[PDB]
């Protein structure tokens, strides 16, 4: 039976829809531990040895322990399961990607047959399946999502703003049609960057920030305070959730947050 580790738990998660145990899906970063700063302990190297083939996210979210995926099994590919999304930038103009291209509906479905095409090459005879599975986690995607876009493509043109504390919604409002503000755009920083925020804020009147799961929500309550604006509580993005928690799954979790984000622009 062949091993595939997902480099975090949302692509593990999306690893698992598709499988559904024709292979073992692991994952390196697991929830609640952090994808955009982790140390591969020596249990975690056993994963990496037993991996015939290792899922990526790109767009740099590895970049600090890409390191540690050496001396692997003859035949264990890496595969980057954002290929074919335009990357958007952490600057505001050339600058590093932006990582978080999985907060999208469009993307969703990119994840999926990237992930579909990757285990369909590893595991040929169980192509069928993939192929199934695939397209039906596609819709069932589609069928949560859909109805939460629909609704927010109902705000004016003059509201169509995502305003957060980490950048992590750049690809769902390039998905959406939005405008997105925030206050630093990788967790783990910058006065400029809150005072942009700020300004920004009140002079399109935006009425909400939100904060997210893994960072503090000290920041977004001060420029909320600044601005007249309102506190909008705490998204899911980078994680998921613990599994007694509201977003366990990559499904659940854009559904928590999109929702999230829709109850507040109404
Ligand atoms: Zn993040």
């Known amino acids: 039976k062949k091993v595939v580790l997902s480099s975090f738990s949302i692509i593990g998660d999306i690893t698992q829809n598709i499988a559904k145990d024709l292979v073992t899906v ?25 991996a015939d083939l290792i899922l990526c996210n790109g767009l740099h979210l590895e970049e600090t322990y890409m390191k540690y995926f050496t001396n692997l099994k003859k035949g264990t590919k890496i595969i980057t399961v954002t290929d074919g999304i335009n990357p958007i930038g952490v600057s505001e103009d050339d600058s590093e990607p932006n990582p978080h291209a999985w907060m999208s509906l469009t993307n969703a479905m990119i ?26 986690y596609s819709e069932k995607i589609r069928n949560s999502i859909l109805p939460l876009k629909t609704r927010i493509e109902k705000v004016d043109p003059e509201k169509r703003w995502f305003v957060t504390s980490e950048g992590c919604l750049v690809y769902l409002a390039e998905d959406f049609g939005f405008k997105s503000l925030y206050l630093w755009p990788i967790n783990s920083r910058s006065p400029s960057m809150m005072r942009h925020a700020i300004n920004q804020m009140r002079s399109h009147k935006i009425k909400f920030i939100f904060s997210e799961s893994t960072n503090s929500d000290q920041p977004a309550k001060q420029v909320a305070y600044e601005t007249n604006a309102s506190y909008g509580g705490v998204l899911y993005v980078d994680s998921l959730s613990k599994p007694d928690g509201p977003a366990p799954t990559y499904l659940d979790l854009l559904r928590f947050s999109l929702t999230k984000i829709v109850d507040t622009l109404f």
Do not use: C, F, M, W
């Open 26 to 50: 692991t994952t390196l970063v697991e929830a609640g531990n952090d994808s955009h700063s982790y140390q591969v302990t020596s249990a975690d190297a056993i994963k990496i040895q037993n």
């Open 111 to 136: 994840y999926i047959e990237n992930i579909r095409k990757a285990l369909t090459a590893l595991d040929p005879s169980n192509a069928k399946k993939y192929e199934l599975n695939a397209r039906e």
